[model samples]
Target: DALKLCPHEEFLRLCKERAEEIYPIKERNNRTRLALIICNTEFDHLPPRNGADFDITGMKELLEGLDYSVDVEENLTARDMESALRAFATRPEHKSSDSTFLVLMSHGILEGICGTVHDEKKPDVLLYDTIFQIFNNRNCLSLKDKPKVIIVQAARGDAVYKTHVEKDFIAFCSSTPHNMGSIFITQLITCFQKYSWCCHLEEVFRKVQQSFETPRAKAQMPTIERLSMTRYFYLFPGN
Candidate 1:
């Protein structure tokens, strides 16, 4: 029980040491990159969100600028989204990727997110937890132990905070339950522009937190929650 009772410093030290010993990933930079972008702007019965058009356009260019072979999609039923997610798991590029990203912009609640989810037979929604499971070490073997970055511009951070509880996964939430806008998305994009693709994500995330010095940004706020990953992650990923 001493391990459980140990101070935060000791816990962190153990985490880093164990992570190094267990994962043992070879450090390489600027290698080939792959990304998955899902922009769910329309739902079956829910009113459509046209605002995400700006975010989707900006992100496609942003990822392409970083040289990611991006796979972008829109408006899907729950099962279709799952199919796309699983399909990525089996891609050759996904298997060889140095690192990867998954971005979801949709209307959401605190517990989960919403995609189209419209099937003749069934459906109210697709759980945000879909990401956590699809990218799990067991199902998504390609991403096992590799750093995965997920971005959500909907719902409270709690939605992902509870679900993305896995090693080598990081999720960023743009705003809170009440704060709804595109400002955080712009701030996130700009952070990458300032840092480019070759550094620890923590650096960019920290800066994003500091972004929007004005009260509006202060009230809404961005959140970053991650698991496992102890080493610095490369984005454009070249040393």
Candidate 2:
């Protein structure tokens, strides 16, 4: 059966309109500010073809073109991520006066409590809820009524039943729990590199969600849950 999709031209037009509408309300600064964190622990400590280089590069290009001052951190540990996040939240220059973006790229496993990494002992694994909670306390409030975005491109548990919901915060994950597949980081990079119609943040996330739903893409059922409080908030909106 053939699939129904919006034409590329229509998609781009709508996306650009939305972006421009939101541009004024967005926390304007001397420039757009972004902090990108990439964490890649080799599977079993063996060198593998997995990392966040692709995502970092693609994001740099896109945001730079849009006049953002971007800070890139690659192959970070849990501690590194925590410190950087804290700094981003508290530091004057990195604060949300001009909008903020946080990208986490890594491997994850669901262990009832939170997400786990390969080398980390199960007991030491980091929980998704915990990570967000920390950020929520630190940065979310600062960006209250402002644009604060997070893109999580990581694998979840081997089980395929876990579904994640988006909340007041804008978050995009690679796939649902239990269905292992290609990381969204790579797909996102490819899309951005093509200079496709992903100019708007919300549109980019919607496309990522659709890609996960494609049968040919292994159809991992990506989930999105927005908190009731943030229901009307649009990363990009039509005027």
Candidate 3:
């Protein structure tokens, strides 16, 4: 069953009480929340991501249910991904949007997320660090001070990391220990659907992490990083 939203009266009361602690929510009539999804399921040289389609389908449904206008792109090369992100960041919708979500699901290496075509010598990949730079306040003014939720499900070697000076950004990166299947997205949807009406994004992420704590869940541990958000972010599902 789908989750129910907080009653309008209750939601208004909660907002008034925690006005300083939570990010401001725009009026439903005026608000526009946009989400970008880039999923690489097939690779020319690398192994195929068999279950990634399931993740994409679920994610689109989840975000849409939360009132986000989702734009999904599949099987892009590293260069194409970079371009797509830049374009999304520059979109006109951000000016009126309360927040934005960026999701990337792909095969990864230590250097970064891999493209459809992986050439060891040429290194066809999108560095994780570049994501921050692309969406930095200086470059993406429309989304400044607005939550930029980044959800990445890639088997990564590591990040050429940098401290984010930008505000209102949270990232979830999954460390797929077993590579048995795409469990991260499933847990993500489950936790959000169960708790989003009453809890904030961080709390929902905590529940998602807890889902992996069982013995049958294997050793996979997802991480929450680059969390510079100064306020709680509520999806306010069905609002």
Candidate 4:
């Protein structure tokens, strides 16, 4: 019934037909590959987030298998989040990598992502926009125009952070609210673990969306807002 307006079965069949399609594994032109993962699961005054580390572990392993160098940070305050982003932007590795991924998972407010609080009832927040500004053409010249796939697995299910209007990256939310697909991130990691080949990035998202059920847990579908992306981006693109 879903096919009444779209194509799913056909695409999977095509994957079978083109059995020789292999995903590009190495960074193009000998560039260094990097994936920065940040997770904020603790708050000094708020309830602690359980199981967030597992999601981090799953995603970290997935990136490593894909040959991207991974940096993982956990339990950050608002200040720390910004610092990490700034520091990462300055990394010499960006000069050589054509692709990058930043996976941020945390409790979030509508304005931005939530961080730890000390001596305060409320946690500090990082503006969703700050996430992209650090990597945009103006700030991170070495990373301009390269494809950056930023995935946020919102703990307890917050909407994915808003999309950046710049042409460098895409930010995706895992879903509507909490307790939904506690495994969505893991499911995503699983989908891409196919060492033999890779599909389009969009397709990877599609598969991750389709992998989960239970409306009580998944009240909303995965979401993405496109501020700017010149061409369609692929995950492990066919080599």
Best TM-score among the predictions, by candidate number: 3
Per-residue CA lDDT of model 4 for 1-239, tens digit only, reads 00011134444554456534422233345858788999877777666668887777777777765557899989998899999989988899877776788998877766677787733455588877788777877778877777778887654432233334366577778644554225667567666654114456666677666765566545555667543655545444222
User: Which residue pairs collide in model 1, if any?
Assistant: 30-237, 30-238, 197-236
What would the TM-scores of all predictions be? 0.74, 0.63, 0.93, 0.76
Candidate numbers, best TM-score first, in rank order: 3, 4, 1, 2
- The pairs that clash in candidate 2 are 114-127, 159-178, 160-178, 165-225, 166-225, 166-226, 167-227
Better of 2 and 3 by lDDT: 3
Which candidate wins on lDDT? 3
| Model 3 Cα RMSD, 1 decimal | 2.7
Query: lDDT of each model, Cα atoms only?
Result: 0.66, 0.49, 0.85, 0.67
lDDT of 3 by residue, 58-118 (tens): 9999899888999999999999999999999999989999999999988888657888987
TM-score, structure 3 vs. true: 0.93
Best first by lDDT, ranked? 3, 4, 1, 2
- Model 3 segments beyond 4 Å from truth? 156-164, 177-181, 216-218
After TM-score superposition, the amount by which residue 8's alpha carbon in candidate 1 deviates from its true location, in angstroms, is 36
What's the number of clashes in each of the models?
3, 7, 2, 7
Better of 2 and 4 by lDDT: 4
Worst 10 residues of 4 by lDDT: 1-10
